[PDB]
Structure formats: structure tokens, C-alpha cells
Ligand SMILES: [Ca+2]
């Protein structure tokens with residue numbers, strides 16, 4: 108119980124941290140010429156077409 | 160800056176030079192930003208020069224700046240309670256600015272508690288209450304913004320609504336009159352009432368309370384009397400009629416199932432097996448299910464008429480859909496004959512799902528609804544752990560299917576997962592499925608199966624089960640952090656969902672706008 | 684309890700732990716603490732074809748094992 | 764230093780000698796013995812691959828962190 112409440116204190120951060128660290132572990136081994144082809148640097152999204 | 164010396168005197172608050180210049184007259188010029196001298200005195204809050212400047216022609220009392228504010232805004236913006244008392248002693252007009260804000264809004268925005276306490280204690284309160292204008296994103300309503308910003312003066316306002324009007328405490332003629340004039344009908348405040356884009360939902364003051372979680376204001380007595388006014392007028396009546404419709408389906412099923420041996424088939428006249436005993440009982444509940452389940456169709460088909468494409472997002476609707484369609488083909492021997500094994504098979508679907516659905520209808524209660532929302536929120540997080548369950552269960556299930564193939568609890572791969580599912584709760588059949596096979600040399604892989612068992616006993620009944628307990632503890636403590644608010648929020652959102660579909664002519668008949676209660680006659 | 688009790692009263696009527704509707708609620712009450720008689724009340728009837736509704740009763744059992752010994756029991760632990 | 768690598772190592776080496784009768788004949792009791800190692804460890808390893816998800820990965824890290832503290836209590840278990 109004390110272990111799970113420690114994890115769920117940062118549960119919303121831990122999922123995004125695993126998302127970020129996945130890519131940074133992935134792009135470190137990826138060849139750089141492929142990166143320039145695959146990155147697009149900007150995006151266009153149509154919304155309605157489809158503490159103390 | 161174009162300021163006259165009268166501006167410069169009233170800016171720094173010196174009454175006598177203001178009194179000296181008024182002996183010779185300074186004509187109340189407007190500077191850049193169009194401020195008058197009364198604006199500067201109202202800015203600093205020097206009431207002493209404000210008293211001396213309100214004894215002349217007072218043509219600056221209604222003067223406006225470049226943004227439309229008068230001097231009443233600036234005193235209310237900078238927190239000078241004695242200033243606004245001095246200004247409201249005279250006939251200060253209440254005109255919005257060009258951002259459509261009255262002086263009450265700026266005090267509510269800048270959180271001047273002692274100022275709005277002097278507004279509420281003084282006279283002229285109702286016309287500055289109604290002075291607000293609609294269709295503006297800020298400056299919505301002085302009641303609702305008082306909820307959103309300053310609950311404690313709003314509490315003091317509620318003490319003015321609660322008057323006893325009878326000094327004899329604990330008397331037979333002792334009474335308490337509550338007024339509900341500040342809790343509803345926001346269009347009834349404005350006397351002009353254009354109602355062009357007026358799309359106000361009911362119970363605006365209460366909805367703002369649960370959205371701004373001011374739980375100390377919900378337990379104020381006039382709010383409880385306002386809820387109990389709505390509850391006793393229609394709210395108990397409709398909730399009885401909704402449940403009583405469903406209870407008229409649920410009880411006649413349960414009477415029908417406990418009086419019939421569950422193998423047999425039945426006409427309306429009795430059991431085939433021919434019993435023909437208490438057929439007057441069996442005929443009337445078999446009808447009463449069939450009539451009620453047809454009403455459930457028109458209840459649901461009426462509900463998809465009110466909501467297209469929002470109906471399908473709920474899980475209760477497909478629950479309610481599976482409720483009725485078996486109850487028809489449970490009692491279908493009223494009309495056409497069906498085989499017996501079919502008739503009970505949908506029956507066990509029905510009576511299981513009836514009470515399981517009936518658990519949902521008591522969620523709209525004040526003393527038992529907090530367990531239903533707790534039962535749902537645990538069930539949601541367990542559903543998110545289904546892929547952890549399936550890959551753990553099917554791992555141990557297939558390995559036990561290999562290792563313990565000679566024993567009939569693992570003869571089938573499908574059966575082995577279910578037996579592993581029954582092994583989850585610590586009911587490991589250690590003796591008659593591991594040990595006695597091992598002492599009879601009936602284990603094909605003895606060293607593996609014991610090692611598989613010990614590794615099973617670590618993971619599933621200990622680690623996986625304490626994970627669900629640890630999930631449920633942190634989940635329940637999250638809910639019970641706002642348990643006292645969640646019950647009242649479900650009370651408020653019930654009525655606002657109910658009054659939106661209710662016809663307005665009925666509302667004028669049923670509302671009474673005030674009540675009389677005799678008490679002794681019946682953070683950091 | 685009376686939901687799972689009456690459904691087990693229909694599905695497992697041939698076995699004496701569910702012969703009476705009153706008895707079926709009590710056996711469901713004794714089934715609450717994880718003491719599911721899985722072998723001598725589900726499995727051995729199924730391998731002797733003594734279940735009238737085999738696909739339902741296993742589905743009723745799995746849905747029982749979710750709700751009462753896991754969700755309902757952890758709710759009481761989380762309340763306590 | 765990883766424990767998943769020796770997990771992944773024990774994944775493949777039995778799956779070869781599970782299907783090894785593609786080439787050479789092995790005794791039957793050996794072939795299923797590594798098979799029960801394989802299919803148990805496959806899905807147990809497959810639990811780790813879904814850790815890289817957005818909606819179910821939070822249970823995997825919770826399942827690991829409970830398992831770490833239980834492993835630290837092994838000497839309390841063994842001597843008891
Ligand atoms: Ca519905």
C-alpha cells in the first residue's frame with residue numbers, strides 16, 4: 108500500500124517520462140540521414156474536419 | 160498629465176486645500192484618462208476629502224473616465240469600505256464600464272471582502288444586484304461571481320435570508336422563514352428581461368457552488384432547505400416514479416423465480432412438469448414483467464429521442480438494453496411456446512442483471528451513493544489492469560496445462576485458465592493436485608511443477624492481489640477526500656438534469672420561492 | 684448477494700448447496716471470502732455433464748470472482 | 764546489469780530445443796520440459812514489452828516495484 112501510493116504520487120508524470128525516455132533511447136541509435144527525412148518541424152491539425 | 164491642482168490635492172488626500180480650492184472653485188476638469196478629482200480621492204480612499212467634495216454641485220458623481228468607470232468603481236477596486244459607504248450614502252449611479260462591469264464586479268475581482276460586506280449591509284442592494292448585464296464572459300452574475308471568488312461574504316448574505324421572525328426560542332409558535340430569492344431565477348433579477356441569448360440552466364447558484372467546491376456554503380442551512388424544497392416538491396416524486404417503474408419489473412421477476420423450480424417450463428396457467436397451483440400468482444407477475452419491460456423500451460427509445468449519439472457512450476444503456484430483452488423472452492410463454500432450457504437460460508441472465516442494474520438506481524441517494532461511486536471507480540482501475548491479468552493468467556494457465564495434464568482440472572487449455580483463475584484467491588489445491596500426485600509419481604516434471612507452484616504463489620496470490628488492494632486503498636482515499644461534496648454534487652446535478660426536461664408551466668406551479676419551518680412544532 | 688444468489692439458484696439447482704433459494708444466498712455469503720468451491724461445485728459437475736448451462740455458469744463464476752471476493756472485499760479493506 | 768537480458772536469453776534457448784525436431788530427434792520428455800519453460804516465460808517476458816505503453820505501463824512499474832520489495836524480504840521469508 109505504501110509502495111503503490113508512492114508510485115501513484117507521480118503516476119501522471121511517470122507515463123510521460125517513459126514516453127520521453129523511449130524516444131531518446133531510440134533516436135540515439137537511429138541514423139541521422141533518416142532523421143532529416145522523417146522530421147517535419149511543424150504540424151497542421153484540423154479539429155473539426157475528422158503547488159503550495 | 161493635464162491634472163488641475165484639485166486633482167493633485169485629492170490624489171494625496173488633503174481635505175483643507177480641497178476645501179480651500181472649492182472656496183475659489185476649480186470647475187472639476189477632466190484630465191488625460193478623463194479622471195475627475197473625485198476619482199483621485201476615491202482612488203486613495205481618503206474619505207475625509209470625499210465628504211468635503213460631496214457638498215458641492217456633485218456633477219462629478221456621474222462623470223465617467225475613458226473606460227466608463229465612475230468614482231464608485233475606483234473605491235470598490237482599491238478596497239476602501241468607508242468610501243463606498245460614503246458614496247452610497249449619496250445617490251451614486253451604478254453604470255457598467257465599457258468592459259460591462261459594475262463596481263460590484265471589480266470589488267469581487269479584486270477580492271475586497273470588507274467592501275462588499277458594506278455593500279450588503281447597506282441599502283440600495285437590490286438595484287446593484289440587478290445592474291449586471293448578460294452575454295459577457297466576465298461579469299456574469301453578482302451572485303455567481305460571489306460564489307466563485309468570495310464565499311465568506313456570500314455566507315453572510317445567506318444569514319440575511321434566514322430570519323427567525325420569532326424571538327421565543329423552542330416555542331410552539333416558533334418558526335423560521337427561509338427566503339430563496341438569491342439562489343435561483345437569475346432572469347427574474349433584471350426588470351427589463353430581454354431574454355435574447357438567455358440560456359441559463361436551472362440552479363445557477365448551486366451549480367456554481369459545486370463547481371467552485373465551496374462545501375462550507377452547501378452545508379449552510381438555507382441551502383439544505385433549498386435542496387429539500389426541490390426534493391419534496393418534485394424531486395422525491397420523480398425519483399419514486401423512476402424507481403417504482405423499475406421495481407415493478409424487478410420484484411415480479413424475483414417472486415417468479417423463487418416460486419418455480421428452475422428446471423421446468425410454464426404456461427401462464429402453471430407448470431408443465433401439470434401443477435396448476437397458485438396460477439393466480441404466476442399469471443399476474445408474468446404479465447407484470449412483460450408490461451414493465453415494454454415500458455423500458457419506450458423509456459429507452461424515449462431517451463434516444465432526447466439524446467442522439469450521446470446515448471451510446473454510456474455503459475448503462477447497453478446494460479438496460481440487455482435487461483429488457485431477456486425479460487421478454489423469459490415470460491414469452493404468455494404468447495408463444497419456447498423450449499424450457501432456453502427460457503431459464505435467459506432467466507439467469509435476467510435476475511442476475513436486474514439487481515446488478517438495480518445497484519445503479521440507488522446511486523442517486525444521500526446515504527448509500529458514496530459506495531456506488533466507490534464501487535465503480537475501483538472497477539474502472541481493475542478494468543485497466545485487464546491486460547496485466549490476461550497475460551499473467553494465460554502464462555500460468557498454459558504452463559500448468561503442460562505440467563499437470565494428467566489431472567482433469569487441467570485437461571483442457573480453456574479449463575486450465577479458469578482453474579488458474581480460481582487459484583488466484585489463495586485457493587491453491589496444494590494437496591490433491593500437487594502433493595498426492597507427487598507421492599504417487601504421477602507428475603511428469605516434479606522439479607518444475609513445484610518450482611512453478613512456488614513462483615505462482617509469489618506472483619498471483621501475493622504480489623498481484625496486494626497490488627489490487629494497494630490500488631483500491633489509494634483510490635478510495637481519493638474519493639473520500641471529497642465524499643461530503645460528492646453526495647451533494649450528485650444531489651444538485653440530479654435536479655439540473657431533471658429540470659431541463661421538465662415543462663416550464665409545471666415549474667411555476669410547483670415552486671414556492673420561500674418556506675416556513677417550525678422547529679419545535681413537530682483551509683490553509 | 685441476492686443477485687448472485689438467485690442466479691446461482693437457477694444455474695446450479697441440481698446441487699444441494701443451491702437447492703433452496705434461501706440456502707443459495709447463504710452459500711453465496713460463504714463464497715464471499717474467496718472460498719469458492721470451484722472443484723466440487725463447478726468443475727466435477729461440468730466434466731459429468733451435470734451443468735444445465737455450462738457456458739453461463741462459468742461466465743457467472745468469473746463475473747462473481749471479479750465482483751465479490753476482489754472488488755467488494757478490497758472496497759471494505761479500503762474503507763477500513 | 765539488466766535482469767531482462769538473462770530473461771530474454773532463457774526465452775530463446777528453450778524455444779530452439781522445443782522445436783529442435785525440425786532437425787534432430789530428441790526424447791519426448793525433454794521436449795516438453797523445455798516447452799513449459801518456454802510458454803511460461805514467453806508471456807511473462809511479454810508482460811515487459813507492454814511496459815512501453817501509455818495506458819497500461821503504470822501497472823507494470825507497480826508490479827515491478829512491489830516485486831523488488833518482496834525480494835528484499837526473502838531472508839525474512841526463508842528463516843520464517
Ligand atoms: Ca437509460
Ligand SMILES: [Ca+2]
Nearest residue numbers: 765767768771
Ligand atoms: Ca535485450
